[PDB]
A and B are shown apart, each in its own frame.
Chain A
Amino acid sequence: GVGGSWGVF
C-alpha cells in the first residue's frame, strides 16, 4: 500500500 492506513469512525 501507499502511505499509512487510517479509518474513520
Chain B
Amino acid sequence: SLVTCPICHAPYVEEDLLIQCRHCERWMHAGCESLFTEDDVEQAADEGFDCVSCQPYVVK
C-alpha cells in the first residue's frame, strides 16, 4: 500500500484524495473506490470504509 493499489496495481504520485480500509489497513485511491467527492468519503469514513476485498469476503 501507499504505492500500489489492489484495484489499480500501479504506481502513483502522492496526490488526489486518499482513503484506507481499516479492516485491511490498506491505502487506495478514492476514485477507484467509487469515491468522487471529499464530502462523500468524509461520511463514508465516519461510518467506516470497506475496500473491494471486504465486500465479497464479508458477504457470502
Interface residues on A, range: under 10
Size of the B side of the interface (Cβ < 8 Å), in residues, is: 21
Number of A-B contacts (CB under 8 A): 41
Which of A5, A8, A9 lies in contact with B20, CB distance below 8 A?
Answer: A5
Complex-state Cα separation, A6 to B30, whole angstroms: 9
B22 touches A5 (CB 8 A): yes
A9 touches B16 (CB 8 A): yes
Please list the 9 inter-chain residue pairs (A to B) with the smallest Cβ-Cβ separation, ordered nearest first: A4-B49, A6-B19, A4-B45, A6-B45, A7-B18, A5-B20, A4-B22, A3-B48, A3-B46
**Interface residues in chain A, defined as those with a beta carbon under 8 Å from any beta carbon in chain B:** 1, 3-9
